[PDB]
Amino acid sequence: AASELYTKYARVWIPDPEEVWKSAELLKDYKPGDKVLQLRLDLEYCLDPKTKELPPLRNPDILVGENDLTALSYLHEPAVLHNLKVRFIDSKLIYTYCGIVLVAINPYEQLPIYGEDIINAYSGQNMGDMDPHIFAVAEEAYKQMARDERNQSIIVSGESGAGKTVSAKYAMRYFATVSNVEEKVLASNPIMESIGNAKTTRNDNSSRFGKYIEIGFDKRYRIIGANMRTYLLEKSRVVFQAEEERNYHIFYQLCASAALPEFKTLRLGNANYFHYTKQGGSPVIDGIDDAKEMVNTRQACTLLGISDSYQMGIFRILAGILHLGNVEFASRDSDSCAIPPKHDPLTIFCDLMGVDYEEMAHWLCHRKLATATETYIKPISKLHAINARDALAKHIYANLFNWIVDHVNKALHSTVKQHSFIGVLDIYGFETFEINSFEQFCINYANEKLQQQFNMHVFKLEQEEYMKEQIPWTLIDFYDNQPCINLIEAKMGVLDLLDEECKMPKGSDDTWAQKLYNTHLNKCALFEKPRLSNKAFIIKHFADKVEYQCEGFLEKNKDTVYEEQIKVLKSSKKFKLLPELFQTSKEHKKTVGHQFRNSLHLLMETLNATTPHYVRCIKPNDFKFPFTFDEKRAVQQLRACGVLETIRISAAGFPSRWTYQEFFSRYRVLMKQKDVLSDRKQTCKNVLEKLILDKDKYQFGKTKIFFRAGQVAYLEKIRADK
Predict the structure, then answer these.
(1) Distance (Å, rounded) from C-alpha 718 to C-alpha 667?
(2) Domain Myosin motor, which positions?
(3) Diameter over CA atoms, the chain
(4) Which entry of 73, 96, 207, 560 is annotated as an active-site residue?
(5) CA angle 144-148-150, nearest 5°?
(6) Does residue 152 contact residue 611 with C-beta atoms inside 8 Å?
(7) 8 A C-beta contact, residue 176 and residue 119
(8) Cβ(416)–Cβ(224) under 8 Å?
């Protein structure tokens, strides 16, 4: 250990409120068992006696600025941060490899780096031969489709507004130029934002679901079309919104265009008139005109062949849902309830939908149970009827969302047989607010799951690198997320309990919290309980520790739709769409948690049947400013992307990788001609066996030396000393 690196004139990184880290030289040599550190930025950094932990060391210049983050010798947050910052600001480079990962910082301006000249430079090349570019990732995907006879997936994660739609477009521009999909898929984006995005406390245009777009190729490996799948939809949002948040964009679009002549009939008020759209107390997004955004959505529908008729159907269904949310209930007693007579909301529901007020009014307040003997109808509480109303709304929405996806798909599908595909996934990354609820819990769960599948891919490839290089592959450690995932999704886990409790007549938020404690507290390290509360739990997620408020969890998870409620609607006539939506019983007993898990294992299956490549998209600042880099936002983004964990894992094995030549040709000056044999590979072994005495700071393989973190910076320092 000794630690003869904290010398005098050695750079380190210390913390900083405005920049997160400040670069700080040295004045005095650090003495073992010291407690100080004199620095001329001038202060005396004082470490804490128990931690006795030194600030992270800075990297030597030959490595600063590198195209690959895992060629830094000191792999830590500052180095990563500093490296991304100088490339972006000084050199205007948006793309940086992180091992097999592409990091893409959104520059908030159009760059002249996507033309045919550049495309051509990248066709044929191998990964890493050239400078990092989204095109390189496309090339790999395309090249490998052809040589492995196997479909590929490019996963593009990050917060919406971070440049994922740009990344997908240029993967498509690239695919279409080395082999009219791109124009058609981008024309669909506004259809898909209107129904799947929504304002939250932290993004005015957050995407609440995963979009996978399979780009189809023929046997001559040319593009023929596209097919979109979707997963992970936040159904909760359709009927509940937190303070400051909104329902899906399309609902608000519709209610700010209520006065339009052809929506007279939908008798829409403004967005504060509807239960399903006013809970957040903020119907207008500053700088956003919901009425203007509606014309883009229809234009988009028109452009993917959705007829003005079917379009009118969409908004008929949606006005439907809104009005449904206003159906009020009066309970007769704990066990039953009724809809007031001559009740406006359901009058309008029923006129729009094309059904009988009375038959609806009835199955809104009753329930058909069936047993082997026979069947019977019972009344149901005001509460169970809210839950059924909401479930119906959610079910209408979900199936309207699938309807609209099928019909985009018809505009995208090709007749030519398809031999293979490359799917671009547009998924979110980690989400933490000051207050966290069911929705964040779902995003984070998906994120552990996408992180595990990434870790296991990297780990396969490392094992493969080791076999080739003739180092024993079992020497590679795995950093496993399966315990956090079981804690969430396995028998007796968070979601299983949430299900159980939801079925208990007396079960509430506080009684589920208690089952969480009695089952996991002090019995699972990934599970903490805040010392000062009984209504919150904590999960040690890979990227960060997250506190969840239990409020709302039991209601949001419930999702039992009643078949009688459906069949009423499944039988309209004054309206072609509505019955189309519903063209069984176990599937809709299922909670939102449970459906989420199914959608998520659907998504993993899809990706596991393919070779994945990875792109991480970050926002450098909070205002869409061109080439501007805010350190606090950068770290948060890289963290929520998994890049900081990716880099930690890397930093714990043998990240630096020099070929024997690269090494001889850098460190020739460090050896004496006496020890320079005719065998190059053997000289280096001997030479380095002297220069670094401890043997497990590096592994010798066939063609490369593999180094521990800091060993190249050590080498480079004694190249300067001389």
Answers:
(1) 10
(2) 64-720
(3) 103
(4) 207
(5) 85
(6) yes
(7) no
(8) yes
Euclidean distance between CA atoms 510 and 88, whole angstroms: 48
Determine the Cα–Cα distance for residues 389 and 320; give it in Å rounded to an integer. Answer: 12
Q: What is the DSSP string of 574-594?
A: S-SHHHHHH--TTTTT--HHH
Catalytic residue among 59, 106, 206, 437: 206
Catalytic residue among 161, 320, 423, 710: 161
Options 1.20.58.530, 1.20.1050.10, 1.10.10.60, 2.60.40.10; which CATH number does 438-557 get? 1.20.58.530
Phi (first) and psi of residue 340, to 5 degrees: -45, 145
Token digits for 579? 């019955």
Is 160 among the catalytic positions? yes
- The technique is X-ray
> Which one, of 422, 438, 407, lies nearest residue 195 by Cα?
407
The answer to whether 161 is a known catalytic residue is yes
In sequence order, which residues have a C-beta less than 8 Å from that of residue 40 and are 6 or more positions away?
24, 25, 27
Which residues on neighbouring strands pair with residue 228, listed in sequence order? Answer: 213
Active site residue 420: no
Distance between CA atoms of 54 and 37, rounded to whole angstroms?
9
203 labelled catalytic: yes
Q: What are phi and psi of 367, to 5 degrees?
A: -150, 135
Alpha-carbon gap, residue 571 to 579, rounded angstroms: 6
Query: What phi and psi values does residue 208 have, to the nearest 5 degrees?
Result: -105, 40
- Written as one letter, the residue type at 103 is V
Q: In this structure, are strands 366-370 and 375-379 parallel, antiparallel, or unpaired?
A: antiparallel
**Resolution, expressed in angstroms to one decimal:** 2.7
Which of 229, 710, 627 is CA-nearest to residue 426? 229
Distance between CA atoms of 116 and 120, rounded to whole angstroms? Answer: 6
Cα distances from 93 to residues 66, 115, 449, 573, in angstroms, run 11, 16, 30, 58
Strands 38-39 and 43-44: antiparallel
Catalytic residue list contains 572? no
Crossing angle for the helix pair 643-651 and 77-89, to the nearest 10 degrees: 120
Contact criterion met (CB below 8 Å) for 388 and 562? yes
**Among residues 502, 496, 526, 484, which one has the least CA distance to residue 597?**
496
CB proximity list for 187: less than 8 A, separation 6 or greater: 300, 303, 304
Q: Which of 358, 325, 320 is nearest to 342 (CA)?
A: 358
**Residue ranges for the binding site?**
158-165
Q: Is 73 a catalytic residue?
A: no
| Contact assessment for residue 704 and residue 469, using Cβ atoms and an 8 Å cutoff | yes
Q: Which member of 70, 96, 157, 165 is catalytic?
A: 165
For the annotated binding site for ATP, the residues are: 158-165
Active site annotation includes 4:
no
Q: In whole angstroms, give the CA distance from residue 460 to residue 472.
A: 14
